[PDB]
Amino acid sequence: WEPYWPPDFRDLLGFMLFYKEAPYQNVTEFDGQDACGSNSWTVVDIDPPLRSNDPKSQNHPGWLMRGLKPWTQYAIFVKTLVGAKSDIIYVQTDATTFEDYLHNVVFV
Amino acid sequence: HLYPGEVCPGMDIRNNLTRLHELENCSVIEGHLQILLMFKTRPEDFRDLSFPKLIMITDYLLLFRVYGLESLKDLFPNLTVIRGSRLFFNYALVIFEMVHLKELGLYNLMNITRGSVRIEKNNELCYLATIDWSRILDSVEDNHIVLNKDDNEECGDICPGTAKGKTNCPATVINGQFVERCWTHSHCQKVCPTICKSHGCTAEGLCCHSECLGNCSQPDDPTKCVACRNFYLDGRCVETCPPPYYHFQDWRCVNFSFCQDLHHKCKNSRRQGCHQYVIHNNKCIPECPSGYTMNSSNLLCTPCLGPCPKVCHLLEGEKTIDSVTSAQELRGCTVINGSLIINIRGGNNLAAELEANLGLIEEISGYLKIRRSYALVSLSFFRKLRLIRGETLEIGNYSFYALDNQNLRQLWDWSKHNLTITQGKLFFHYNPKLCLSEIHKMEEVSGTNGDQASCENELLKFSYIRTSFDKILLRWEPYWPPDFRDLLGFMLFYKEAPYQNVTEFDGQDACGSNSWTVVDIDPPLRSNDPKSQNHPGWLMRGLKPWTQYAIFVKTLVTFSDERRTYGAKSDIIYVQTDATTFEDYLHNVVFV
Amino acid sequence: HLCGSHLVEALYLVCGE
Amino acid sequence: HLCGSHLVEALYLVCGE
Amino acid sequence: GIVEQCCASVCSLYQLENYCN
Amino acid sequence: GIVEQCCASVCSLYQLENYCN
Ligand SMILES: *[C@@H]1O[C@H](CO[C@@H]2O[C@@H](C)[C@@H](O)[C@@H](O)[C@@H]2O)[C@@H](O[C@@H]2O[C@H](CO)[C@@H](O)[C@H](O)[C@H]2NC(C)=O)[C@H](O)[C@H]1NC(C)=O
Ligand SMILES: *[C@@H]1O[C@H](CO[C@@H]2O[C@@H](C)[C@@H](O)[C@@H](O)[C@@H]2O)[C@@H](O)[C@H](O)[C@H]1NC(C)=O
């Protein structure tokens, strides 16, 4: 996702990625009070990137989500440590190839 | 010089014969010897290969799938003792799937001190029936010698050669049959008179010295042994190591300096490549036995003052603590070898739980990092932490790093706690409730911060105090900021206290289980300028009688216009609820 | 090792129905 | 499939050291 | 499943046989 | 373990390769 740069671009420190297993639409940030303890969101602290000069400095912060169920929709969004937050995107993990549903059906 | 050449470490030789020449000067292998998986080798590769210096192996000998090798008579002609201090699955000698081996030919092998023999699946192997193993091992019951050529009707084992069947090899009985004993067509098995026991004898049948094992060059002389029954020192076999020497690897005498060299700082490699040798009961050993710890300046194991210190070596030199469960993994640790990252966002009774699991840590060899630990108000749960070495540092050469901890108000109480930081720098950013004075105190003690906190400042004083057995009524100074306008709130804290030892930043109030009873006191109504001290107060009820209470007031945290101040807190006063009148103690006593 | 279309083929080597 | 002594052999087919 | 037994896995030349219809 | 990977199991012709010394 886009790199964030405040007015004085100096000392950029942190991103925060949120993801939960979601059905359709009905997902919000301020959902079922994360408060202190039992949480409603799976959270990742993402270290600020390294710029690497001025011409082509988009060394786009990212993250590899592992430990996800297959054929599952995930509500996901990023936030900049207390600037900008991304919108809630739903991402569905991969499921079976049609070919591979067939096999398992067609061969005991 | 009973073992004139080198003492070599254990070896594991595979694929090629190249590394095998590393044995060329060894008299003793202090460890095991495994030779395996040589599929391209042929007899020619072994025709001119010999290690006649090898007398002894302290652990075990294993040979597996070595092609082209037909006998061991030229490879290890003088191997006399296999001690079996460490074994391969209870075996001191393993010969397995040696396709091409026709005989063992270990014609100098006299004693296997511990462990058994496993000789299995050697399709060309003969000269096994001719070996009397009862001369070599105390118990042959656990030997496993099967699936060799010897099992079928194809071995033409022949010992006689010089004259053939007229005064040659010694013969011993199996059950009822006498069998001549030999290793090869040209080598007899050595058999000594029974009086010699395991000590060995000369060719003339004269007993070796009682400190010898297996063989000697001269009778009854402990400087003429091929190997020792007990310990070896300066070309002599001794029963025990004399001063100033130590018993090492259950076979030799070494000096303090040797043990010291082994010990010293095998930098990283804790996991199989260090141990750090110690002295205990005149032995130089890998580690202190149970109930002992190592006195550092002299490598000497001493009994533990209470429970032994516990060194916890972290995987990859780091560990992130983000829960009570991960903290528990360090329960009992007094020394951390590595670095800790604290990332605790929520939970319950954290100060007590964290103190239970992490409160014994006295030292951290790397760095300590506290980051996004939203739940923490203090680091005091690290009750015994006195040293951070900084042997490893966070990028930017930091040994202590605190970033984005939104409720952190205390590091340690610097009136009581001492913490030393040998190397590295400090990093503090985005700790809004942590005053720079606390950070500056830490710099002194150890050798975006506080922006959302007003740090103590003014003093509220109690204008009135009243006790009841069950109640306490208090009044205190009214607080008025510069622009006296919009005054909103006081906060009164009280806990049952013994004597003296009471603080604000006590046992992390955080979010949930609290260490302090708290009252929100509505701001008073001024009632003009002349006589406006309508002193805020409070009536404490629900108190135990004859009980000391730690009490103090605070003015609610105000973001001020220009030079920002929240205001004032009162000092901690102790107030003891009423008890019995003397008169009344007397009565109850004097009248049943 | 075994996969995709090859599974079908691998099974026929074995089946021979 | 793979086993016993054959594992050693199977590995050498592959190794070829 | 057969997919799970031999594709996202490795199946024994006999496991493979068994249910040949 | 290698025993557990290919004997009390079945190991992929590549799993087999990997740690060839
Ligand atoms: C408060 O300290 C006591 C004991 O310490 C001393 O006495 C105090 C009154 C105060 O003057 C201190 O500065 C002194 O160092 C601690 O009491 C422990 O309480 C438990 C209760 O079951 C008991 O088992 C222990 O034996 C006590 N320990 C000792 C050394 O007597 C108490 O932990 C201290 N509390 C705090 C919050 O500091
Ligand atoms: C046998 O000795 C030869 C001479 O070097 C010695 O061995 C090395 C390893 C050091 O210990 C050195 O101090 C000695 O002078 C070597 O060519 C040969 O590699 C040695 N073989 C063994 C057993 O290491």
Tab-separated table of N, CA and C in Angstrom, chain B residues 56 77 98 101 169 193 259 265 269 377 385 404 453 545 555:
chain	number	residue	atom	x	y	z
B	56	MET	N	43.353	-46.081	21.092
B	56	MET	CA	42.139	-46.037	21.850
B	56	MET	C	41.088	-45.048	21.386
B	77	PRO	N	45.489	-51.409	13.112
B	77	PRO	CA	46.213	-52.577	13.615
B	77	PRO	C	46.462	-52.588	15.112
B	98	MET	N	28.629	-53.538	5.722
B	98	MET	CA	29.975	-53.400	5.189
B	98	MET	C	30.120	-54.493	4.121
B	101	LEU	N	33.551	-56.498	3.431
B	101	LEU	CA	34.363	-56.855	4.597
B	101	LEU	C	34.410	-58.349	4.792
B	169	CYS	N	47.631	-70.946	17.695
B	169	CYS	CA	46.714	-70.052	18.415
B	169	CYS	C	46.170	-70.676	19.687
B	193	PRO	N	46.881	-65.319	30.989
B	193	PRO	CA	46.499	-66.076	32.183
B	193	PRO	C	45.456	-65.299	32.988
B	259	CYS	N	41.264	-26.775	31.479
B	259	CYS	CA	39.847	-26.663	31.759
B	259	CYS	C	39.366	-25.239	31.514
B	265	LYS	N	34.736	-18.587	26.514
B	265	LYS	CA	33.792	-17.813	25.753
B	265	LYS	C	33.684	-18.268	24.344
B	269	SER	N	27.536	-20.318	20.041
B	269	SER	CA	27.242	-21.754	20.042
B	269	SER	C	27.004	-22.413	21.418
B	377	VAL	N	1.689	0.457	32.607
B	377	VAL	CA	1.809	1.723	33.315
B	377	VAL	C	3.198	1.812	33.958
B	385	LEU	N	15.523	-6.977	37.953
B	385	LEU	CA	16.414	-6.645	36.837
B	385	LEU	C	17.439	-5.585	37.219
B	404	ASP	N	6.211	4.199	21.624
B	404	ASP	CA	4.758	4.151	21.488
B	404	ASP	C	4.065	3.317	22.566
B	453	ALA	N	1.285	14.484	29.999
B	453	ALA	CA	1.357	14.425	31.454
B	453	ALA	C	1.831	15.745	32.053
B	545	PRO	N	-12.172	-0.908	61.310
B	545	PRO	CA	-11.673	-0.108	62.443
B	545	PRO	C	-10.250	-0.480	62.856
B	555	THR	N	-5.638	16.648	41.398
B	555	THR	CA	-6.551	17.465	40.603
B	555	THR	C	-6.608	16.896	39.187
